[PDB]
Design an enzyme around this catalytic site. Structure first.
Site, PDB file in Angstrom:
ATOM      1  N   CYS A  73       0.691  -1.310  -0.096  1.00  0.00           N
ATOM      2  CA  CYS A  73       0.064   0.061   0.096  1.00  0.00           C
ATOM      3  C   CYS A  73       0.742   1.008  -0.035  1.00  0.00           C
ATOM      4  O   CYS A  73       0.769   2.256  -0.794  1.00  0.00           O
ATOM      5  CB  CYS A  73      -0.845  -0.013   1.373  1.00  0.00           C
ATOM      6  SG  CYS A  73      -2.379  -0.818   1.061  1.00  0.00           S
ATOM      7  N   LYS A  74       1.947   1.347   0.733  1.00  0.00           N
ATOM      8  CA  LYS A  74       2.507   2.745   1.238  1.00  0.00           C
ATOM      9  C   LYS A  74       3.956   2.279   0.710  1.00  0.00           C
ATOM     10  O   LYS A  74       4.811   1.261   1.252  1.00  0.00           O
ATOM     11  CB  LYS A  74       2.639   3.134   2.535  1.00  0.00           C
ATOM     12  CG  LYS A  74       2.808   1.872   3.518  1.00  0.00           C
ATOM     13  CD  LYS A  74       2.956   2.610   5.164  1.00  0.00           C
ATOM     14  CE  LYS A  74       1.489   2.800   5.356  1.00  0.00           C
ATOM     15  NZ  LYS A  74       0.810   1.203   5.523  1.00  0.00           N
TER      16      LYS A  74
ATOM     17  N   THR B 224     -20.045   5.210   0.442  1.00  0.00           N
ATOM     18  CA  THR B 224     -19.571   4.700  -1.082  1.00  0.00           C
ATOM     19  C   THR B 224     -18.787   6.003  -1.833  1.00  0.00           C
ATOM     20  O   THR B 224     -19.287   6.830  -1.675  1.00  0.00           O
ATOM     21  CB  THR B 224     -20.601   4.114  -1.869  1.00  0.00           C
ATOM     22  OG1 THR B 224     -21.645   4.925  -1.890  1.00  0.00           O
ATOM     23  CG2 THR B 224     -21.119   2.743  -1.297  1.00  0.00           C
TER      24      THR B 224
ATOM     25  N   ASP C  64      -1.105  -6.179  16.120  1.00  0.00           N
ATOM     26  CA  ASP C  64      -1.356  -6.788  14.865  1.00  0.00           C
ATOM     27  C   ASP C  64      -0.182  -6.564  13.978  1.00  0.00           C
ATOM     28  O   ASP C  64       0.237  -5.564  13.701  1.00  0.00           O
ATOM     29  CB  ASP C  64      -2.868  -6.042  14.488  1.00  0.00           C
ATOM     30  CG  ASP C  64      -2.553  -4.826  14.121  1.00  0.00           C
ATOM     31  OD1 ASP C  64      -2.166  -3.853  15.091  1.00  0.00           O
ATOM     32  OD2 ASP C  64      -2.803  -4.392  12.913  1.00  0.00           O
TER      33      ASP C  64
END
Ligand SMILES: [Zn+2]
Ligand SMILES: [Zn+2]
Ligand SMILES: [Zn+2]
Ligand SMILES: [Zn+2]
Ligand SMILES: [Zn+2]
EC number: 2.7.9.3
Lengths: 154, 303, 379, 379, 379
Positions: free
Chosen positions: D31-32, D164, D265
Site C-alpha cells: 500500500c505505502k 461509497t 497486529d
DNA sequence: GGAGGGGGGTGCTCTTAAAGGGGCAGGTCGC
DNA sequence: GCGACCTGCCCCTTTAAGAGCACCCCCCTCC
C-alpha cells in the site's frame, strides 16, 4: 432544427443582457435599440406611445372586451392565457411561492410583495425609480413600475 | 418514603429469572436488540436492560408477574410495583419514562387493558379500602409536576378530575380552553389578597334555566401555599406559557399532544393536535387508581 | 494557517503551478458520477433483514437509525446508544488547511443531523498521493492535519488515531462517534403535515468550487466568460470555502431548542436526492415540496450556461459540507432563523425556509419553477 | 456464493480476462512505498499537546490506547472506554467474496490486539473504481458486500452503515467500535524481561500474493520459475488467502486466560515494523528479539530472487490481515500455543514462538542470522 | 372478466398473432367516411310528414322529441312515453370483454343524454366475422357476451334477447328501451344565452385507438414514432379503453339535480357535428361556441402530425362511447363539475366546461385556436 | 441543393399596479 | 348602559396589463 447553444452579449452600453443564441442577438439589437420609433394607440383617449409594433396589438386587447379564454371549472372569461393559468391555481389549491423567513405561502408574487413589508426588506434594497423613490430590489422591476405607473404617454 | 424501589427491583428480578429459565429450557435461538450479536435474555438487573428489552419485559409482567403466594397481583399493587420500577430507574441514572416515552407505548396499552375493568374492593370488613397508590406516591416518582411535557399534561388531568370531579372520559373531552376561565376576583376585605382560581361550569342537566347558585354549579381550584410546586393555578399558568399562541382562544380541546423533542429552554412544549381518545382514556384509567382521587370522587357522587 | 488570507505556494517554497486540486480529477457530476447505482450500493450496505426480529413484537426502534445516515446502535450496558458516522471527501479547495477543516466539518455534519451537539472521539484517514513529489508531501500534509485537528478542537472533540494509506487521489475523511443517552439525539421520523423545511447553508458550493478551476484554463473559461466575470467567481469561491468550513453545532442546539422533528445533511447527491431519502423514513404519509433554493451569487446563471453538467435547478447537484434540512413547525422555524441569524452565543449565520411538508405520498419534489434566492456576498 | 470454492468469472457472465486485482498498481512495498514518512504522519495525527494535561497530576492511562493503534477513549458515563480501530486496504486477491472477508478481518485485527473479543458496530467503506465496467460492478460489488457482512456475522457484529466513493483503485475498509469496561481490554505496556513473543499466523502472505499475480505475465515469471516451481504458488496462494480470512477472535480470548502482557497486529509495516512500535510504549525497559520467522511455504526462497521488492528476511515485508504478536511469559506460551492448536470446539491453528524478550533499550531487532520455518500447508 | 389482467390470446388457447381488431377496416375518419351523407340518410329515415298533423292546434312535444336521437314516441296507456335508442360499433379494442362493455355503454349513452337513468330492457346484436375460425368464435364470443351482460347489470337492466347474423366484420351493438313518466326525462330543446357547455369525457379516443394499432405496422409507426413514445401510447390506450367502457349514469342523474336545459352524446360525427345537430333543435335563437377541447394526453400532437386524418382541433374526429355535452347555467355548471368529481356514491370522474352559449342563428362553431387541455392519466 | 440570413408574428415567464371583497374600527339612533 | 345600523379605512388577494426572450413560420438567398 434547434441549433447548438451559444451565448453572446450585447456590447452596447446600458444593455448587459446575454442571449441564448447568436440568432437572437440580431433580433434583440434591431427590435430594441436600432429601431427607434413612436406609435400612438388608435383609441381616441388612450394617448399612450409604443415604439414596437408588437406591443400595439396586445394593447388593442386592453381597449376592447374580447375574452376568448374560459376556465375549465368556473367558466370565467379571461383576456390572456397566463391570466387563466394564474386563475386555475384557485381551483387546484396550490400555493407555489413561500416567504423565506416565516414560511408564509401565497399564490402570486403580488401577495408576497405585501408580506415582505412585515419582514421589512426594502432597507437592503438599493434600486429605486427616480420619480417617486419606490425602493425596488432588482433593475427590471423599475421598468415594470415605470410601465404600470409613471406611464410614458402624450 | 411512600414509594420503595427495592420491591419493584425484586419483582423484576424474580420475573426475569423465571423468564430466563423458560427461555433456556425451550432452548430456542432468539436475538437481542443490542448491537453486539447475543442471544436475547432479560437482565436480572433493571439498569443494564436495553430500551427495547424493558418494553417487552415490562409488557409481559402485566400477565406473568407473580408473588410469594403465587396469586397474580391485583391491578393497584401492580401499578404500585411499576411506579417502584420507575423510581428505581430514576435513582440509578436512567432517564427513560416508561409511562410517557413513545418507545414505551405498548406497555401503556397493556397496563390500560389490565386496569380497564377494575373496581374498588369492599372485601375488607371496613367499607372503604385504601388503595396502595397514593397522591404522594406519584409526586415522589416525578409522574406529576412540570418536569416534562407529558407529566405536566398528566398533572392537569389529575387536578381537573379532582376538583372539577370529571370522572368520566367524556367530561374531560368536552373540556376546552375557552370554557375554562381564570378570574382574580380580588377581595377588598384582605389587602393584596391576590386570590386566583379557575372556574368551570358543570354538566348538570336540569329543566330550570339560569344560574341558580354560583358555587353549586361550578368548581373552583385554589392556590396551595404548602408547596409552590403543587399549586394547580401555578401549573395551569405554566401550561399556557408553554403552549402555542394560536391554540389559545380555541374551544375545541384543552389537552395538546406533547412535542416528541423538547429542551429545558424551549419556549414551546406542545403541538396543535389534541391528544387522541385512546391516549385520553389510557391516561384516565391510570389516574382513577389513586387513593385520594378515588375517595374524592366517591364522596362527591354519593353526596 | 487560518489568519493568512490564502495559501500561497511560493511562501512555502513550492512550485507556483502547484494546485492541491490537481491530484483529484474533478467531474461535473462530482464524486457521485453514478447516482442511482451508488444509492443502491449504499442501501445494500445498510440492507439488513434479520434485524426485523418479528418487529420485536411492536414498533421496535430501528437499529439502522435514519437508515441512510448516522446509524444508532443500542449498547448492552448503561442504556446508551452509540452514534457514529463516516464520510470521505477528496480535495476540492486549493488551501490545504481549509480543506482539512472542510473534511472534518463534513465528517461531523452527520452527527449534527441528529442533534448530537458534543462528540467523543474522531478518527482520521489521510490518503497520500502517489503522483506527489516527496518534498511537496512534507509541506501539505502537516497543514491538512493541523486543519483537521483545529476543526476537531472547535467541535469539542480530539482527533486520536486514524490511518494513512497511499492512493492516486488524496483521500480525506474520518469517523465521528458519540456515546449518548436517548434524549441527546433526535430520530428523524416525526415529520407531520403543515411543517416547514429550513436550510442552514446555501446551495451551489459545487459550482463555485468547480468554476474556480476553470479560471486558468482558457477553453473552459470562454464558455462562461459572458455570464459570470472573474472577481465575482473569486468572491463566490471564498464564500463557499468559508461556508463549507463552518460547523452545525449551533444548528443542533437550536434543533433541540425549537422542537425539530427530522433533519438531514446535504452532502453529496443533492438537495432533492437527500430530501427523497429523508421522506422515506417518516412514519406518517408526508411528502416534502421545496419552493425556494438559496444559491451563492452568480451561480444559477453558471449552472444554466454549463447545461446538464451541474443542474442546480433540479436539485441533483452534489454538495460538500452542506447544511441541515430541518423540519420544524411554522412558528418555531420563524423563530429558528431569527435566533441563528443573530445569536448572542456565537457569530451570526443565515437560514432560509425552502419548503412545506405536504401529506400523502412519502415523496420529495421541487416545484416546476422554483424561486432562486441569490445569497448576498456577505454584504 | 459462499459455498463456492473459487471465483469463476465465466459463471457471472464475465470474460475470463477480468481480474479483480487488475485495478491496483501493486508495488512490492504494498500500500505505502514509504514507512518513515507514513509513520511520521501517523504519529503527527495521533499526537496532541493538550492531551497530556500534565498527566492529570497522576498516572493517566494513554488516550491513544496501544499508542499507535486501537485508541481507548474514556467516556463520561460509568467509566466506560470507547475502543475503535480503522484500516483500509486495496484488493490483492482475485476472489471477490474472499476479499470482503479479508477486509473485515483486517479492521478487527487491531481491535483484537487490545484484548477486545466482542464488537458493537462496524461501518464499511466501499471504493468502487471508475475504470470498472458498468456490467461488472452490478455483479462484482455485491459479492464484496455479502462477504464483508458474512465476516461481520462471524465476528458477532452487524454492518449498519458505511459510505461509497469513486476511486481509481478499489478501496475496502471499515471502522469497528467497542464500548467496554476496564476489565475487558489489555493495555500493551506491562511487558517484562523474561517473556516470549507468539505469532499466531504464518508470515509472508504478500510474497505469495504478488508472485501469484505475476503468474500470468511471462516477463517476470521466467526468473521466479528457477527458484521455485509454479505449483507451489497455487497452494501457497490458497493458504495465504485462507490465513487472511480467519479472525484472531479465538486468540484474543486466550490472551485473557494466559496473562498476555501486550499484543499487536502484524499488518502493513511488517513483523519488525510493529515490533519496534510495540516496544516503544512498554513502560518497562525492555527489548524484543525475533529468533524465528515462520515464513510461508517456500516464500523465503522466492524472496531471495527479488533483492528488495519483498525484503522478508529483514522483516519489513508488508502483511495483510496478519496474526497477532503476544508477549506471554515463558510458562504460559507452552500451553497457549497448544490450546490454540487444539481448541475444545475445534478449528485450531498453529502459533510460533518467534522470539524472546530481554531487558534494555526500548527497541526491536531481528537477529543477524534469523532461522526460517516453512509452515506446512493444509490440504 | 378481463379487468383483472390484460387479455392474453395464449391464455385462451389463441395464437400470438391473433388480434380482435383485425376484423374491421379501421380508418381515421371512423366507421363512416362520408359523415355528411350519413347525416342526410339519418334525417331521411327519421323525417316523417304525417307527424305535423296540422300542429294539433297547439304546441306539444314532437314524436321525434328532438329529431336526431332518442325518439320519445308517446304511448296510449297512462300517458307514458317510450324513449328508445340504437347504436352499432365495430370492434376497436383487442380485449373482447372490454369491447362488449364498450358496446353496451355506447348503446346506453343515448338514453343518458335525455336524462333517463333507468332502462327496462335491452337487446343485443352480435355479429360473427366470416374470416374468424371456429376455434376463435367459441373463445371470443362468450367473453363479448359476458362483458355485455356485466355492463347491462351495472346499468340496472338486463339483456333479454337479440339476434345473431353473419357479417364480413364483427358487428357489436344493441337497443335500449325505457317507458317513463313525462317528468323523468329532459327533452333537450331548451337553451338560453349565458349557459355553459359541459363535457364528461375527454376527446381523442379514436386517435389513441388508431395509434395503438400502428405499433405492429412498421410503415406507419416510423411516421409517428418521432412524436410519441410507446409508453405514452400504452397509457393513452388504457385510459381510452377505461373511459370508453364507462357509463354516464351519474351524469344523467346529476343532470336533473342541476337544472339541465339540453344534452347530447359525442358518439360519432365528432364534437362539432353533434353540437351543430343539437343547436338546430333549440327553440330559441342560440348558437354554441367551444373554446376548450379536453384531449387525452399526447394525442393532439399525433392528431396534428398525421395531417388531415383526425383534425381534433377542428372538432371532427369521431368518438365511441363519448361523453355528454350538457348545457347548464353558469353557477350550476360550476357546481356540476365539483360533485361529479367526488360523488357521494363515490367513484367520481372529472368534467370540463368546454364553451359558452350566445345569441345566434342555431349554429355551433369552434374558436380559431382552441385551448387544448391535456387530461392526465389519473390512476 | 442548400444551410444561413432577413423579416414577421407569438406564447410564456416574470413583474407591477388597480380593483375588489372582507373585516376592524369610528359615529348616530333606538331601546 | 347596551345594542343595531351606516359608513370609513386598512388588509390581503385576485385580475389586468406591460417587458422581453425564445421560438416558429415563411421567404429569400447567392455559393
Ligand atoms: Zn442590447
Ligand atoms: Zn391604447
Ligand atoms: Zn376558474
Ligand atoms: Zn415572512
Ligand atoms: Zn415611481
Amino acid at each position: 432544427k434547434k441549433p447548438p447553444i451559444q451565448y453572446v452579449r450585447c456590447e452596447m452600453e446600458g444593455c448587459g443582457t446575454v442571449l441564448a443564441h447568436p440568432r437572437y442577438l440580431q433580433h434583440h439589437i434591431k427590435y430594441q435599440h436600432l429601431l427607434k420609433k413612436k406609435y400612438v394607440c388608435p383609441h381616441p383617449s388612450c394617448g399612450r406611445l409604443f415604439r414596437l409594433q408588437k406591443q400595439l396589438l396586445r394593447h388593442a386587447k386592453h381597449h376592447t372586451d374580447q375574452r376568448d379564454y374560459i376556465c375549465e371549472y368556473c367558466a370565467r372569461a379571461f383576456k390572456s392565457s397566463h391570466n387563466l393559468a394564474v386563475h386555475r391555481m384557485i381551483h387546484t389549491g396550490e400555493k407555489p411561492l413561500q416567504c423565506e423567513i416565516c414560511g408564509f405561502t401565497c399564490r402570486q408574487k403580488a401577495s408576497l410583495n405585501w408580506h415582505m413589508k412585515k419582514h421589512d426588506a426594502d432597507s437592503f434594497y438599493q434600486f429605486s425609480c427616480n420619480i417617486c423613490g419606490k425602493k425596488f430590489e432588482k433593475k427590471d422591476s423599475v421598468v415594470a413600475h415605470k410601465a404600470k405607473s409613471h406611464p410614458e404617454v402624450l | 418514603n411512600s414509594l420503595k424501589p427495592e420491591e419493584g427491583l425484586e419483582v423484576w428480578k424474580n420475573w426475569a429469572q423465571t423468564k430466563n429459565a423458560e427461555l433456556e429450557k425451550d432452548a430456542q435461538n432468539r436475538l437481542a436488540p443490542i448491537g453486539r450479536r447475543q442471544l436475547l435474555r432479560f437482565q436480572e438487573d433493571l439498569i443494564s436492560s436495553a430500551v427495547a428489552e424493558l418494553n417487552y419485559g415490562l409488557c409481559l409482567m402485566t400477565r406473568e408477574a407473580r408473588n410469594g403466594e403465587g396469586e397474580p397481583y391485583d391491578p393497584d399493587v401492580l401499578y404500585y410495583i411499576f411506579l417502584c420500577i420507575q423510581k428505581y430507574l430514576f435513582e440509578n441514572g436512567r432517564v427513560d419514562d416508561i409511562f410517557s416515552d413513545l418507545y414505551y407505548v405498548r406497555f401503556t396499552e397493556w397496563l390500560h387493558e389490565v386496569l380497564k375493568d377494575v373496581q374498588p374492593r369492599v372485601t375488607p370488613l371496613g367499607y372503604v379500602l385504601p388503595s396502595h397508590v397514593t397522591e404522594e406516591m406519584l409526586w415522589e416518582c416525578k409522574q406529576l409536576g412540570a418536569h416534562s411535557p407529558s407529566t405536566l399534561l398528566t398533572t392537569l388531568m389529575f387536578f381537573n378530575t379532582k376538583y372539577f370531579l370529571l370522572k368520566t372520559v367524556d367530561q374531560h373531552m368536552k373540556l376546552a380552553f375557552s370554557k375554562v376561565l381564570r378570574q382574580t376576583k380580588k377581595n377588598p376585605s384582605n389587602p393584596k389578597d391576590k386570590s386566583t382560581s379557575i372556574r368551570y361550569l358543570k354538566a348538570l342537566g336540569i329543566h330550570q334555566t339560569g344560574q341558580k347558585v354560583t358555587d353549586d354549579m361550578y368548581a373552583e381550584q385554589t392556590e396551595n401555599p404548602e408547596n409552590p410546586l403543587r399549586c394547580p393555578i401555578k401549573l395551569y399558568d405554566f401550561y399556557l406559557f408553554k403552549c402555542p399562541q394560536s391554540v389559545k382562544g380555541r374551544n375545541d380541546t384543552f389537552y395538546l399532544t406533547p412535542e416528541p423533542v423538547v429542551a429545558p429552554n424551549s419556549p414551546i412544549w406542545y403541538s396543535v393536535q389534541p391528544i387522541s381518545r385512546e391516549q385520553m382514556g389510557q391516561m384516565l384509567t391510570r389516574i382513577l387508581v389513586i387513593r385520594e382521587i378515588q375517595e374524592a370522587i366517591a364522596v362527591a357522587n354519593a353526596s | 494557517m487560518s489568519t493568512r488570507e490564502s495559501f500561497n505556494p511560493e511562501s512555502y517554497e513550492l512550485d507556483k503551478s502547484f494546485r492541491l486540486t490537481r491530484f483529484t480529477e474533478l467531474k461535473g457530476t462530482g464524486c457521485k458520477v453514478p447516482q442511482d447505482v451508488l444509492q443502491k450500493l449504499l442501501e445494500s450496505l445498510q440492507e439488513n433483514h434479520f434485524q426485523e426480529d418479528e418487529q420485536f413484537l411492536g414498533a421496535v426502534m430501528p437499529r439502522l437509525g435514519i437508515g441512510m445516515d448516522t446509524c444508532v446502535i443500542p449498547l448492552r450496558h448503561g442504556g446508551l446508544s452509540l452514534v457514529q458516522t463516516t464520510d470521505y471527501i477528496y480535495p476540492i479547495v486549493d488551501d490545504p488547511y481549509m480543506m482539512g477543516r472542510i473534511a472534518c466539518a463534513n465528517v461531523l455534519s452527520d452527527l449534527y443531523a441528529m442533534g448530537v451537539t458534543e462528540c467523543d472521539n474522531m478518527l482520521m484517514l489521510l490518503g497520500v498521493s502517489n503522483k506527489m513529489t516527496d518534498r511537496e508531501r512534507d509541506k501539505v500534509m502537516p497543514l491538512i492535519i493541523q486543519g483537521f485537528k483545529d476543526a476537531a478542537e472547535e467541535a469539542g472533540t480530539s482527533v486520536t488515531g486514524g490511518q494513512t494509506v497511499l492512493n492516486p487521489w488524496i483521500v480525506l475523511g474520518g469517523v465521528a462517534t458519540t456515546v449518548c443517552q436517548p434524549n441527546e439525539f433526535i430520530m428523524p421520523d416525526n415529520a407531520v403535515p403543515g411543517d416547514v423545511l429550513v436550510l442552514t447553508k446555501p446551495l451551489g458550493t459545487q459550482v463555485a468550487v468547480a468554476v474556480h478551476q476553470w479560471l486558468d484554463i482558457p477553453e473552459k473559461w470562454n464558455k462562461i466568460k459572458l455570464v459570470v466575470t472573474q472577481e465575482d467567481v473569486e468572491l463566490a469561491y471564498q464564500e463557499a470555502m468559508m461556508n463549507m468550513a463552518r460547523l452545525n453545532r449551533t444548528a443542533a442546539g437550536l434543533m433541540h431548542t425549537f422542537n425539530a422533528h427530522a433533519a438531514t445533511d446535504i452532502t453529496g447527491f443533492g438537495i432533492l436526492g437527500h430530501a427523497q431519502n429523508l421522506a422515506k423514513q417518516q412514519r406518517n404519509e408526508v411528502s416534502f415540496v421545496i419552493h425556494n433554493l438559496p444559491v451563492l451569487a452568480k451561480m444559477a446563471a453558471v449552472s444554466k450556461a454549463c447545461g446538464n453538467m451541474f443542474g442546480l435547478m433540479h436539485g441533483t447537484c452534489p454538495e460538500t459540507s452542506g447544511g441541515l434540512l430541518i423540519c420544524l413547525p411554522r412558528e418555531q422555524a420563524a423563530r429558528f432563523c431569527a435566533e441563528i441569524k443573530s445569536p448572542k452565543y456565537g457569530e451570526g449565520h443565515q437560514a432560509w425556509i425552502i419548503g412545506i411538508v405536504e401529506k400523502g405520498n412519502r415523496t420529495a419534489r421541487i416545484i416546476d419553477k422554483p424561486r432562486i434566492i441569490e445569497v448576498a456576498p456577505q454584504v
